[PDB]
Amino acid sequence: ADQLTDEQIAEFKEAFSLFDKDGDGTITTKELGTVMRSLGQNPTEAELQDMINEVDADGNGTIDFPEFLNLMARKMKDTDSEEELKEAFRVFDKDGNGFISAAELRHVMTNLGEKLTDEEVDEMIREADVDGDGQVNYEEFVQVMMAK
C-alpha cells in the first residue's frame, strides 16, 4: 500500500479543486474532460468513463476526494519512477527547452484554471528559481513539488 502525510493530503485537496470547479465535492467526466482539453488533450467520452471507472470505487459515476487520494497514493508500476514527474515538467515547459519561462507558466496556470495575476506568477518563478536565471529548470521544479 502506501501512507500519505497530512501535508500531502492537503496539497492533493487543492489539486482536486482544479478539477471540481463547481465545488460540489466530485469530479464528473465533463469536469475531467474540460481540464484535459484546456491542457491540449482530446479524450473521448469512452476514455473519460474508463478513467473515472478506475478510481470510482463506489461506482457512483464520479470521483470524490477520498477516491482522488487513492489515485495519488497508488505506487508507480512503470519501472522508471521519475518519468511521471518529468512528464509533468514537460507540460509546463511548453517549448521543451528544459526551462519553464514566466510566459509558459502563465499559460499553464490559465489553462488549469488557476487564476493568478502576472505578479503572482512571477512570485512562483522566484520561489522555484534557485540559480537565478529567471526561469525554472527540472531540478528546481522537483524541489518545489516536494511536500517537504
Binding site: 496539497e11 492533493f12 487543492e14 489539486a15 479543486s17 482544479l18 478539477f19 475531467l32 481540464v35 484535459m36 491542457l39 488533450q41 479524450p43 476514455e47 478513467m51 478506475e54 478510481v55 482522488f68 489515485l71 495519488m72 497508488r74 511521471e84 514527474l85 512528464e87 509533468a88 507540460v91 509546463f92 499553464v108 496556470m109 488549469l112 488557476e114 493568478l116 503572482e120 512562483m124 520561489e127 522555484a128 521544479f141 518545489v144 513539488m145 516536494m146 511536500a147
Partner: peptide
C-alpha cells in the same frame, strides 16, 4: 510551494488517469 503543488499534482493526476 502550494501553487506549484496544486497545479503540478493536477497535471500528475491526469497523467495517472490516462496512458502515455
Amino acid at each position: 510551494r502550494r501553487k506549484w503543488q496544486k497545479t503540478g499534482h493536477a497535471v500528475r493526476a491526469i497523467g495517472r488517469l490516462s496512458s502515455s
